[model samples]
Target chain A: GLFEDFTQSAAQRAIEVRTIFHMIGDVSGKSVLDLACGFGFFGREIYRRGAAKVVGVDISEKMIELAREESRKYGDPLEFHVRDVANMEPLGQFDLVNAAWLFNYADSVENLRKMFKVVRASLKPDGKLVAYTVDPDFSLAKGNFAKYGVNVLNERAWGPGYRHDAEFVTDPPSQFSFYRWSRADYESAIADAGFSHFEWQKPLLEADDIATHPPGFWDVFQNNCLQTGLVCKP
Target chain B: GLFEDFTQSAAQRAIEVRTIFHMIGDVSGKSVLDLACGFGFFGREIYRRGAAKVVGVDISEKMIELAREESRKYGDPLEFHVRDVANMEPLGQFDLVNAAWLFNYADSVENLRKMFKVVRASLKPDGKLVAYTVDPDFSLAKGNFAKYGVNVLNERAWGPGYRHDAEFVTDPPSQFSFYRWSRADYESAIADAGFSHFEWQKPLLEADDIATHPPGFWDVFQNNCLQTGLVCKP
Candidate 1:
């Protein structure tokens, strides 16, 4: 909800189609909880891939209403709710709990742990969870986005401290807190929540995909890969 | 001295040649102090760029010896000594202090503060300091390195806690302590050291650099660009 145009940006599309899909192949037949389900894009994508049911959750009523309104064409088993991923109290079970970008929104490691606890509880036995967040390395403030006339305004660090953040540098700017969660933080929290079969892949653009972009397009994408994914068997 | 091969590697040259010179534009005629002077590469470069005199300090005698030996091919004005950046007792002041990559080697915020105290002392009233460290956002384990025959095995995190590290994923592999220092850590410590006029720039690749490297060569270079720099007026 905090990211600029996250619910409706082409960059978001590239995140989903280019990187997310590769990290999460074939979600067919899984009942999914699209946590932080902005406009229900990820949930809708799963349903399109033949998911048995999709439950979408988000904090913003605007996002929830929009998701609900736009999801009618998808399936009868779809549900949308205004909820926080970390605070939800036993919101049923799903084969997959995909928070997409919510991992970066957490304000503290305590909340990160709390979210992990909730995600574990929300999953069934053998259930999987998928999400991605800002790569700690990509905040380089390098590579100007000439096409969008945008600056990747993501804070290289948060307040001369360990906390990190994200920002959109468009004229009418949009921004949000992006807590710096190192790979160790994510793994330890997930493992503490009793997760296993975990995998964290840096968001990547394959050579084939890299070839499709323009002369300067993939420079930032290569290192930043834009975002990286964390997949686990919960 | 802390980094593997930093005191002696072509990769070190690539870093100094590729990354260092860009961040530090003109060192001409300045008396310099090179902290954690890995092989004195950066100090030697500053001298080559026309520094009046260069004093390099390192904690490793081996690194100091290697630096002294490698530097003989150049000039006799460069000096190397085994010394820790954090514990030095004002080994004489200079117009500029170059830490190059030692800032990332800080194990704790305490050490960072100590290093800053030492750095400020080693600088003239009008002197400046230039240094770089891990971006803390870039270490997502997304892809393998086929180019460097080097694995970007740097841990996105170091432990079950927040102590971060940098690793070069390889067999008989080399690694080092790269505690995550967000821009916040640097500024706070610098401020606490009673200094001002600080700057942090993400490592960058110029048009000339982009033109020189193969297309795929710099994605990691972009993010891993593998660090960011600060040039501060003390």
Candidate 2:
């Protein structure tokens, strides 16, 4: 509950106000299909940006309600449905099919491949997808907790024997899991989903080195940033 | 030469740090064809981002010289040509054809159509084109000049009666012209060139109004954003 709230909270918004909404560019008349649309944060912004239509899908009923409160509650251009992304059915085409923090649920290589194909099937012929997740080069380092406001329980592990995980105790304090990945692994998985072109973007510095933030605030953001924005053409 | 020096100067980099190089997204391994290839600033950036091959075209011999000085001076993957974008012939293909501060020279409807065709012929099947130019909705608002380093000599005039020009006296005081356009005119011209999709993005403040920078500094940036960027499919 706390983790989900954190995603919609002011702290994440300060970081994401640049990372997500600003990075998605202007929507104007674009149609959007949001996957794992928990809490409806991204959808609400997409709507505010002038999306002609929007549909959000998530398995959790509470999350669906959370999203619906922001969406126009059915029989309208904006709608919310209870659905799982892993075994997604065609909900029609969209100019954008955004999946945020959903791909990490791909516990196996097979699941990752499955999620990618679902994403591909949901986009228009010339459409794009923006997926927000962990950065490829992210690893645990000391002082990360104070600066980044996240608690790391274990350092990133390389695969061969491990799941290559970087475990954390997220905000409001509870166990959280992240799969550490390499550039090559992500490309291979993305290729399996039939995308040949892509870009990996990091969160730009949200604030300068001023007295309130000091110098270390921005430095710690770079070293401990847990987010990466992916732009892909299928 | 002062203009070229201005292009390489610090003032230009600050505007471009967000406007051009940052907005272009990631270029890793993508093929690019740059039009109006001035001092080769954007192309150099594409190369820095790991573009597999970069072919820059310009009409100015001095600008071509500037790029060659950095790109090994000859026959290598990164190359330069002195040619007009309006009359560009099939220079093979590229994943992206980028035009920076170009297109205002579309002296007539014919020139605008010609430039679009040239960009089209240069693109691969699933390629894209990004153009950086004046925002259509920009106007002569109050307190715009004091905050923006550049000066606007003439206010924007709407179409049919005028060229709809937004003239500027750039940094270091040089005459520059911008054909301020409406969103409709751009669509009509882009459609004349056979493009069905595009987006217009503005100068976004990366972060919020914090005390250190003073809120007024950012307020002026919003009021004086004279430029707009366009992304299109051909």
Candidate 3:
């Protein structure tokens, strides 16, 4: 699955990590729960940032095994579990719930609603969920995100609640299908799940992040970022 | 000012009108108040859509004069006034408050807050405000919206509260300056002014509208639309 190189791409660091970290702010002494934590990358990353405790959950047993294996190598043992996030139980409330790549997998509106319910129950009253999902406004017809090392294929015509496949040029390459939901649908799920506030945000990058890449490296990505970041408060 | 040709552009009808009218759905028999209603373009258009009462207000006397002259020619006697939105007293609560080009001119946070307050006061309790302003997420450095017949010049570095100049290629070219505010800033002003909910949306187009234009005509505009649509509720 090329899980090891998933978070190491230049696009992920410059576009995804910068904005998400900015939104999460200081994690020192905070407890974290990372959902769909393939190989536990973000879970481990947050742990390195001074989190007191971190728990990672993924549906893949092999991925969780790798997460545990990697933690052993790093000499930092964090908890890992193989469980579906939609069926996830409250593993105690945490300061932050990191769902970087979880929400878009829900195949139905009911399933999507259930996933939000789990997230709601998984958080403390003050806890926040930092998630990234397929941007509803992303234009597939005119988008050429090959510059960002990803290509989204809308085999059928693209519209709200449709399925789109994405191929990422990782070391071994990775491909997956994700469901798209309208902005209204996402907001409805959030509100129905008892969220107080939420925002659909653009990708954030620092001046240095841009300077690290070629002059026009980020132009296409900035204009047509495949993913949209969400910050939701419970 | 090239008022006569402003609304006739293909891009204007396809991109701007399509999304906005969709958001403002079914204005038939509704009272509409248009702020910064230059030449009463939207005001007259809404009236033509069966709006019961439509009043257009602009700061420029000449613009209102032209609006009145055009209204007489069309035999649709819509009301027009020369008034600054931020300073003018609320005439009456309206079913819809159209502020297509009003909020960006707010020079300061206080001014922006004041303008939103005015919008709130002018709206019915359940009334909605549809305002279009400079999108905070618009990328100026990589944006080449010349295909859309507009050029945005960020003389100084772009950031929240920065002033930027824009040139529009109307029959006779027109130029103007507008302020840019971050998404958070706009949300804050809306919340402070008693708006319950708001959304920052993208340019929307219909299939027929797209077919009417040349293929690939909207690629750049969709990628880096200079303006964003806002739907806010009081």
Candidate 1 CAPRI assessment class = incorrect
Residues A53-172, candidate 1: write the lDDT tens digits: 889887777556656765564444579999877888877988888877677677777788899999999999888888776565555355433222222323444432245322232111
**DockQ (0 to 1) for model 2:** 0.01
| Candidate numbers, best lDDT first, in rank order | 3, 1, 2
Higher TM-score: candidate 2 or 3? 3
Residue B69, candidate 1: Cα error in Å is: 47
Worst 10 residues of 1 chain B by lDDT: B1-10
Q: Looking at model 3, give its docking quality level.
A: incorrect
DockQ, candidate 3, comes to 0.01
Q: Candidate 3's residue-wise lDDT over B1-234, tens digit each? A: 112222332244346766778789999989999887766656777887899999988887755776687678668858988887788799899999988768878877778888999999999998999987878777776664545545453444435567765433321113456777778888999999999899887877557556644567666567767778899996
Error of 1 at B84 (Å): 56
lDDT of 2 by residue, A1-234 (tens): 212232322233345546666557888899998886764545766776799888888777755664555345322356888877778788888998887777665665566678778888988878888887666666555223323333333453545111332212110011234565666767787888888888887865544322344334455456666667888887
* Model 1 spans with C-alpha error above 4 angstroms: A1-12, A73-76, A141-150, A154-172, B1-234
DockQ, in order, for the candidates?
0.01, 0.01, 0.01
Task: Give the interface-residue alpha carbon RMSD of model 3.
Answer: 23.2
Give the per-residue lDDT of model 2 (tens digit) for B60-146.
675476557645633345788998778878898898888866776565556666888888888887888887766665565543432
The candidate scoring highest on DockQ is 1
How many angstroms is residue B87 displaced in model 2 relative to the true structure, after the best TM-score fit? 83
